[PDB]
């Protein structure tokens, strides 16, 4: 198969700035008819991919002029001038010169926004869950930027690792932030062994952990 | 307006057969080639093959020759993908795509998600997430814990759809063959608990709908 290698895997661009994505093919994409059937698609979170550029440099109908493709042979570039928030998601290069048709691995475009500290909320288990013999302690780390964050659970001062499940949102189309949930699931008996439950966030926006805690008692 | 529409989410046991549909509207169906594209792991794309809508002749990528079959109902403007003897690795999203005459994909289906699992349909347990009673702030964050369901999806709304600002719902995490997610809503603290906040959870597969008021502890 013709292997399509994209670089970088991710890039962070400020609004109004220019993004540049590289695609290298394992064989020339120059068809016997002299054209290169190298295309660019954008896939937004939860959506199907949509074509931006076909045959190296042709803009699909309704694609803004700030998207431009160039290159020849094995080396191609997509340039996105004047980046806008709704540009975020995963860009794919694809070739159809050769069968099978192939895709690059994707490049994630992240919008740079101002640093935003996570809003941390901790929730004790509900009375309804506890009757079931289960105890889920839920921590939201909401609307933060940049993306990198670390969550730590502490129970009466001791770090807890087992029974923690994390879930991350994609970058938000409206405010360019990320959100994360962290859920510690114990038995009701395990939960009632301890008093003080702490969700600690480590983020660029603070030299100290950003903490929310509660006492069972 | 040209559209490709696909059949709804599928949930199968290993070794079973599934047949997904792709219905085209707004153009002469038999004048364009239909392709099938799999969402590869790490949210890559993988070309499966094409089918000529005028002759019904399919062309498969090597990895899809064994268990995969493309078919047409041209009088219904419909292309089918049949997968036999389902495997765990078949569990992903499948897109159909129309091929434009310059040999790029111009219109895509929204995708069909295929779950491959031995699990039984299980309605979620829906738990309110209210802050620890002891704490007091300008905004308050509330939540809805949607625990132990199968299969995907659930639909989570707040106040029957009337609360949409300041909501996000985390992707489900799969533990012991069951899904769990939480949904976060943020409202002015002056409005809670005076203005009731209700999470609305629908699980189509188990025909369940639950309203859970978030009552202060």
């Amino acid at each position: 198969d013709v292997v399509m290698t994209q670089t970088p895997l991710s890039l962070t661009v400020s609004l109004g700035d220019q993004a540049s994505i590289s695609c290298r093919s394992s064989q020339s994409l120059v068809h016997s008819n002299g054209n290169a059937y190298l295309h660019w698609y954008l896939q937004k979170p939860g959506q199907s991919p949509k074509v931006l550029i076909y045959k190296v440099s042709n803009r699909f109908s309704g694609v803004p002029d700030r998207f431009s493709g160039s290159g020849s042979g094995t080396d191609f570039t997509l340039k996105i001038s004047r980046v806008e928030a709704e540009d975020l998601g995963v860009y794919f290069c694809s070739q159809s010169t050769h069968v099978p048709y192939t895709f690059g691995g994707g490049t994630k475009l992240e919008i740079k926004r101002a640093d935003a500290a996570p809003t941390v909320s901790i929730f004790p288990p509900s009375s309804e869950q506890l009757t079931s013999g289960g105890a889920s302690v839920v921590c939201f780390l909401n609307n933060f930027y940049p993306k990198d964050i670390n969550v730590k659970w502490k129970i009466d001062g001791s770090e807890r690792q087992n029974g923690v499940l994390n879930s991350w949102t994609d970058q938000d189309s409206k405010d360019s932030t990320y959100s994360m949930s962290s859920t510690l699931t114990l038995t009701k008996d395990e939960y009632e062994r301890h008093n003080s439950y702490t969700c600690e966030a480590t983020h660029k926006t603070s030299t100290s952990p950003i903490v929310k805690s509660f006492n069972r008692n | 307006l040209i559209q490709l529409v696909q059949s709804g989410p599928e949930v199968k046991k290993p070794g079973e057969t599934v047949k997904i549909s792709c219905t085209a509207s707004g153009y002469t169906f038999t004048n364009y080639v239909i392709h099938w594209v799999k969402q590869a792991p790490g949210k890559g794309l993988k070309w499966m093959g094409w089918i000529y809508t005028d002759t019904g002749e399919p062309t498969y990528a090597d990895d899809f020759k064994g268990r995969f079959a493309f078919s047409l109902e041209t009088s219904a403007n419909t292309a089918y993908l049949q997968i036999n003897n389902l495997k765990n690795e078949d569990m992903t999203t499948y897109f159909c795509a129309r091929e434009a005459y310059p040999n790029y994909f111009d219109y895509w289906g929204h995708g069909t998600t295929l779950t491959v699992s031995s699990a039984k349909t299980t309605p979620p347990s829906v738990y309110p997430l209210a802050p620890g009673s002891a704490a007091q702030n300008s905004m308050v964050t509330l939540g809805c814990l949607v625990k132990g369901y199968f299969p995907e999806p659930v639909t989570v709304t707040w106040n029957s759809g009337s609360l949409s600002s300041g909501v996000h719902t985390f992707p489900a995490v799969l533990q012991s063959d069951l899904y769990t997610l939480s949904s976060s809503v943020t409202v002015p603290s002056s409005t809670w608990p005076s203005e009731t906040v209700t999470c609305n959870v629908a699980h189509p597969a188990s025909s369940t709908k639950v309203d859970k008021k978030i009552v202060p502890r």
Binding site: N33, N35, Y37, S96, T97 | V33, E99, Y101, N103
Partner: peptide, 5 residues
């Protein structure tokens, strides 16, 4: 179709 078809 330019190529293949």
């Amino acid at each position: 179709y330019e190529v293949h078809h």
